[PDB]
RNA sequence: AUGGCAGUCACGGGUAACGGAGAAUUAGGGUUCGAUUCCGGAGAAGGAGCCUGAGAAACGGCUACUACAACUACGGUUCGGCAGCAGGGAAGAAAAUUGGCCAAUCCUAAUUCAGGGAGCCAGUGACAAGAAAUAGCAAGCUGGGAAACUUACGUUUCUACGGCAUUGAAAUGAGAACAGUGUAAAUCUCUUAGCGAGGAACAAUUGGAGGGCAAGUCAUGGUGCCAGCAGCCGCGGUAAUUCCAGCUCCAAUAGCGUAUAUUAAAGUUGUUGCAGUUAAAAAGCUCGUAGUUGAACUUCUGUUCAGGUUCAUUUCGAUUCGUCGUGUGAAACUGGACAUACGUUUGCAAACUAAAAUCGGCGUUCGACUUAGGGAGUAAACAUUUUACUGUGAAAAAAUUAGAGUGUUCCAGGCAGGUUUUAGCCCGAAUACAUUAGCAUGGAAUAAUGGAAUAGGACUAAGUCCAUUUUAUUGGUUCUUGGAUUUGGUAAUGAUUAAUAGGGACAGUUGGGGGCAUUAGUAUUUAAUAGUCAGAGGUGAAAUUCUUGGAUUUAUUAAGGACUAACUAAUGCGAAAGCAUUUGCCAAAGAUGUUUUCAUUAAUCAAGAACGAAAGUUAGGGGAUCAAAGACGAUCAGAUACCGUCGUAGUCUUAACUAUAAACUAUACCGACUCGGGAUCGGCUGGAAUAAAUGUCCAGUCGGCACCGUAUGAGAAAUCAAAGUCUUUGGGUUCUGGGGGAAG
RNA sequence: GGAAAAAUAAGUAAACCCUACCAUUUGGAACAACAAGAAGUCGUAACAAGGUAUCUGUAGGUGAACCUGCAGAUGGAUCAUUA
């Protein structure tokens, strides 16, 4: 359960058996691909886009319907979210921590927490770099983070 | 699993571990640290020497007795040695300054339960086995 | 995490015959887990068994006869020349009468014994008796 | 030019370290040695230099230096180097004759005849190894017995038998010897005549007799914690089972003690195979690159044929002292074939079939003979790259194992077997193991690695450009052959699931988690404002202490520093240390909920970092209470101690530094399993009553402290639901221990 | 024309000295120090709640064992009491 010798459980999510698309719904792969890229253009995470398509337009599992995973759909349509949610977010809070730390240069529990969060980011870089899914010269230090802030 | 690692790729690890955790053995640690060479005999099994004087030593704990002992000077080594003269009348043969052949008593270290700081046995006087001098029909000078 | 599910599945099963369970559900399963299973089955240790299709990696249910005394795996699956056999036969097996040391070969997976027939054997996999 | 090496241990140090072949013990795995007959290396007193030669830095050749050895008429000289043999000296626990010869094995030379301390002979020689005597037989007496004869202790007999300072002759090597064998000679052995055994002899020792450790229950003598024993327990102080000695016993026995290193016992160094709550041993706690370890999918499967294989057999044929053949069923192997299904080309061979030809009889019935056709049948080219496994090539000899083989058995040599085919016969000198790295090669599992995702790939046709073999050669075209592109065609064009793994998004919610603010509340002190009155305070008793320049006391109020009561419990959160007044911000967290994405991203970790009550430290703050040191009372035989009166540092804080603590569950983290049961804390989902409550209850269920009962499961036990799923000994990984004290 | 002694430069480099450093051995004393033992001497720490408990850490003092402050842990002299 990641960086935790003691805490560990089970959040949820278990894709139902039937691999086909729900009955009630009618939507050529293309129909969705539009919503997906349209929604995406507005500036959305494939992570969030899929959420809409489930809560809003009853599409449980875009992959099951298109035969395409969201991020892929998006990448094929130029609408690819440069840096992956994964890294992006970690770095986001990783940063938020730093700002809070400044005015609270004494908050130790937070120094620690950041240490863990920065640790993770180095784990993703190792990964995303190895899958040639991020330039090798990539480096999160403080400038890589503030670089995205601009 | 247990402490030891069970990988087919981790032989090296186990190897170094054994070579290391192995220093915890005295028998090992002993011969490995050329300790045997530093004792009075310099590893040797026996040593010749000259009687420096016959002294007596007192028994320990539940025993009370005058042990016969000779202080010897080993030849090439040149050390003061505490040597227990065996059986009954034995010391009556050891004349001061004679040549004596000494050996240890049960594994070089602890002396016989009774003795205090003596680690050696006397087997020859002027190059004449003691036992021989102990039994009349054998030898005497 | 998890590793050598053959081991995961195997002990879960032993714990079964040992506790006297009437049947067992093995959660993480693979070709290996199944081959080993039909080899025990074929030799008559376990009873009929069903593989449920977990859309991820199947779950198996094995019926328990009551003849399994022990069935485990062997840590790293060392390599074993045909010459290295008696070493392991006298080692793992409770006698020169229940020879069941499953090995992996290039010739697939054979009984401790079959490997001498085919004349090859190779890496150890597990044992049962 | 600036590289080359390194934690997958460089560089440096030690080695009573020359490396192998091998040696000792060995269930398996291991442990310890290899100076030393084979091989390779190095060296000749240390060190450098050189002549010569095909060949050495030789070294039984030379030059100089350092240290030495021999002669001298002291001018000078040595064919002066024994780690060659034989010897001395030395060292020391420790290792043989200043012998013989060239006869055997080989060597050297101009070389059939010469030389060889190689080598062989012999001497010394209990290193060590093989075989083996110190007595055997019988009469008699006799114990036993015993079977008997048979109500008792008596006779016959016999026997596994067994005893004897009684009997008797046979046997025989030691021994010692004319001969013969053998030898270069000599010694010895072997064959063998004359001679050769009866008790101190022609001969057993060595080491013990409480326990471990086989053997005295002697009422034995001496000794008296003395002499001495004792491997470890322990013997011994006047009646010793361990001393001295007698006797009798035991053990191994031409051998047996002892000392030291070493092997096994040592699952007491542990890969197999340990331990780690309390016995030694989990680090205080988290992060984290090296290292180690990693989820699941990709021809499954069926039919038939065949070769053996096995096993079964209400069974068949053969043989005998235990096998074969035959049939079934069965399994699996194999190998084929075929089934969208492990290959393609070649050449060979080919096996059968469909057409066409020719030939015969009467267009057809049929037959033989041709082209086409793949299996099958070999060899080369292909199936991403290794691991790993099969197999053979290689792994010197000797040694180990081991076949044949009566060296008098045996060690062991490798010889030997039959003269009755004997101027010749028969038969031998086999075989296996050899892991680690290299080569050839068969391969389907696990494991790693790889191929088409920007795109591009694949197959195919044409076009174009570059390069090019044979065409005699040089050009120019063309063309074959490689490569580059463009295009068009073909193909289901190309991205496994989504791990009751992990990372993110999101959603209400929960917490004494944390950082800034803020905010209270009594209380302790101390101060003001009033109020009295003689005692307060403290102890078991009192005593220093305080007090009518007013104490203690009562009311109001204020200042100040710390502290958070009661609610507060096997309840909550935090990595741990630790965290409880209100309210407001700041970034964070679990769990639950998910038909959200991402899809191995992960487990643990040397290095290397973040934290870590107290106490303590530096420089400032602050200073109410309590209080180490200190000052005092009392208590005691003693009290600088346990009580009492005071009091400094600290205790509080800012900023630095310090890292330990019974930093405790004394129980490493991740993972899977297995008994029962309710009650909890957080989230969720159904339901019922009221009521329509951020409530209550019933029922589920994830996740979190904890308890109850119980185990034909664990343990030394206390005890453990894990301290369990470990002799039926192996999910992954880190740290730690190896009798005690000296010692952390 | 060959060619001895002599002499020559660069070179291999013996020995020796000086300047640093390594390895292996071995050495040393009064007083001191360490080791072990006891019915020495003084007291009594610890076990028994061992005079109302040990024990860990840190700090300060003391003939001596040890006492004392602050913080812990029970291996405790409790597994327990809002009505
Ligand atoms: Mg889980
Ligand atoms: Mg004793
Ligand atoms: Mg070296
Ligand atoms: Mg060696
Ligand atoms: Mg040699
Ligand atoms: Mg060579
Ligand atoms: Mg010599
Ligand atoms: Mg000769
Ligand atoms: Mg000759
Ligand atoms: Mg000539
Ligand atoms: Mg000889
Ligand atoms: Mg012998
Ligand atoms: Mg003769
Ligand atoms: Mg006689
Ligand atoms: Mg005797
Ligand atoms: Mg004796
Ligand atoms: Mg005796
Ligand atoms: Mg007596
Ligand atoms: Mg012995
Ligand atoms: Mg030991
Ligand atoms: Mg095919
Ligand atoms: Mg708060
Ligand atoms: Mg007071
Ligand atoms: Mg106030
Ligand atoms: Mg609470
Ligand atoms: Mg409160
Ligand atoms: Mg710090
Ligand atoms: Mg201060
Ligand atoms: Mg008094
Ligand atoms: Mg006070
Ligand atoms: Mg509800
Ligand atoms: Mg409930
Ligand atoms: Mg145990
Ligand atoms: Mg219980
Ligand atoms: Mg184990
Ligand atoms: Mg004392
Ligand atoms: Mg203390
Ligand atoms: Mg102190």
Instruction: List, as one string, the DSSP characters of B84-121.
Output: E--SSGGGGT--TT-EEEEEESSSSSS--TT-SS--EE
The distance of Cα C40 from the centroid of its chain, to the nearest Å, equals 6
Name the minimum distance, in Å, from the CA of B16 to any CA of chain C: 19
- List of E strands, chain B: 47-58, 66-74, 80-84, 99-104, 120-125
CB C75 within 8 A of CB C89: no
Q: Could you say which nucleotides of strand D lie within 7 A of any protein CB atom?
A: 8-9, 14-16, 27-29, 33, 91-94, 207, 225-237, 243-244, 258-263, 268-272, 274-276, 282, 285-289, 291-298, 331-334, 387-391, 434, 442-446, 454, 495, 497-506, 513-516, 574-576, 586-604, 610-612, 655, 668-675, 702-704, 724-726, 728-739
A17: which chain C residues are within 8 Å (Cβ-Cβ)? 55
Beta bridge partners of C49: C62
In a 3-state reduction of DSSP, which class is residue A139?
A: coil
CB B98 within 8 A of CB B64: no
CB contact under 8 A, C77 and B8: yes
Look at strands B120-125 and B80-84 and give their pairing. parallel
Residues of chain B (81-140) having a beta carbon less than 7 angstroms from strand E:
none
**Residue B99 burial by Cβ neighbours in a 10 Å radius (0-12, 13-18, 19+):** middle
In a 3-state reduction of DSSP, which class is residue B44?
A: coil
B62 touches strand E (CB under 7 A): no
Count of beta carbons in the 10 Å neighbourhood of residue C49 = 18
Name the minimum distance, in Å, from the CA of C52 to any CA of chain A: 12
CB A40 within 8 A of CB A49: yes
Contacts of the segment B64-67: beta carbons below 8 A, 24+ positions apart: B65/B114, B67/B114, B67/B115, B67/B118
Nearest to A148 by CA among A67, A84, A63, A78: A84
- The structure tokens listed for A127 are 């990964």
**Residue A23 burial by Cβ neighbours in a 10 Å radius (0-12, 13-18, 19+):** exposed
Q: What is the DSSP letter of A20?
A: S
> What distances in angstroms separate CA C69 from CA A49, B32, C20, C64, one per listed residue?
55, 47, 11, 11
Count of beta carbons in the 10 Å neighbourhood of residue A92 = 13
Indicate which of C2, C76, C78 best probes the interface with B, i.e. most B CBs within 10 Å of its own CB: C76
Look at strands B66-74 and B80-84 and give their pairing. antiparallel
| Separation CA A84–CA A61 (nearest Å) | 20
C4 touches strand D (CB under 7 A): yes
Residue with tokens 């035969």, as numbered in its chain: A67
| Separation CA C45–CA C37 (nearest Å) | 9
- The structure tokens listed for A119 are 């640790």
User: Chains C vs B: touching, with 3+ CB pairs under 8 Å?
Assistant: yes
| Separation CA A48–CA A70 (nearest Å) | 10
Nearest to C52 by CA among C22, C16, C32, C27: C27
CB contact under 8 A, B6 and C75: yes
B137 touches strand D (CB under 7 A): no
CB A54 within 8 A of CB A35: no
Give this entry's resolution in angstroms.
3.9
């Amino acid at each position: 359960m990641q960086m935790k010798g003691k805490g560990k459980g089970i959040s949820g999510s278990a894709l139902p058996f039937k691999r086909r698309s729900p009955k009630w719904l009618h939507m050529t792969p293309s129909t969705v691909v539009d919503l997906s890229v349209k929604l995406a253009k507005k500036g959305l995470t494939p992570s969030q886009i899929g959420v809409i398509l489930r809560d809003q337009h009853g599409i449980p599992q875009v992959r099951f319907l298109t035969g395409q995973k969201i991020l892929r759909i998006l990448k094929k349509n130029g609408c690819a979210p440069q840096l992956p949610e994964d890294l992006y977010f970690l770095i986001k809070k990783a940063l938020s921590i730093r700002k809070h730390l400044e005015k609270n240069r004494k908050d130790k529990d937070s120094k620690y927490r950041l240490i863990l969060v920065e640790s993770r980011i180095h784990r993703l870089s190792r990964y995303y770099k190895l899958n040639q899914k991020l330039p090798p010269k990539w480096k999160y230090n403080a400038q890589t983070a503030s670089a995205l802030v601009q | 699993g247990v402490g030891k690692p069970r990988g087919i790729r981790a032989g090296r690890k186990l190897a170094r571990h054994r070579k290391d955790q192995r220093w915890a053995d005295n028998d090992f640690n002993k011969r490995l640290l050329g300790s045997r060479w530093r004792n009075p005999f310099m590893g040797a099994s026996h040593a010749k020497g000259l009687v420096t004087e016959k002294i007596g030593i007192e028994s320990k704990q539940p025993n009370s007795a005058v042990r016969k002992c000779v202080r010897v000077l080993l030849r090439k080594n040149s050390k003061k040695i505490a040597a227990f003269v065996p059986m009954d009348g034995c010391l009556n043969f050891l004349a001061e300054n004679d040549e004596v052949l000494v050996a240890g008593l049960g594994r070089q270290g602890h002396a016989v339960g009774d003795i205090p700081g003596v680690r050696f046995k006397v087997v020859c006087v002027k190059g004449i086995s003691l036992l021989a001098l102990f039994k009349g029909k054998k030898e005497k000078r | 995490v998890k590793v050598n599910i053959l081991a995961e599945c195997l002990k879960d099963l032993v714990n079964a015959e040992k506790m006297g369970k009437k049947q067992v559900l093995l959660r993480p399963v693979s070709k290996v887990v199944l081959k080993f299973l039909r080899i025990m089955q074929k030799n008559g240790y376990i009873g009929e068994f069903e593989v449920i299709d977990d859309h991820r990696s199947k779950k198996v249910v094995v019926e328990l006869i009551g003849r399994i005394n022990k069935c485990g795996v062997i840590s790293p699956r060392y390599d074993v020349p045909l010459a290295d056999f008696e070493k392991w036969t006298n080692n793992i097996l409770p006698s020169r009468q229940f020879g069941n040391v499953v090995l992996t070969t290039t010739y697939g997976i054979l009984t401790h014994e079959e490997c001498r027939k085919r004349h090859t054997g190779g890496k150890i996999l597990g044992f049962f008796y």
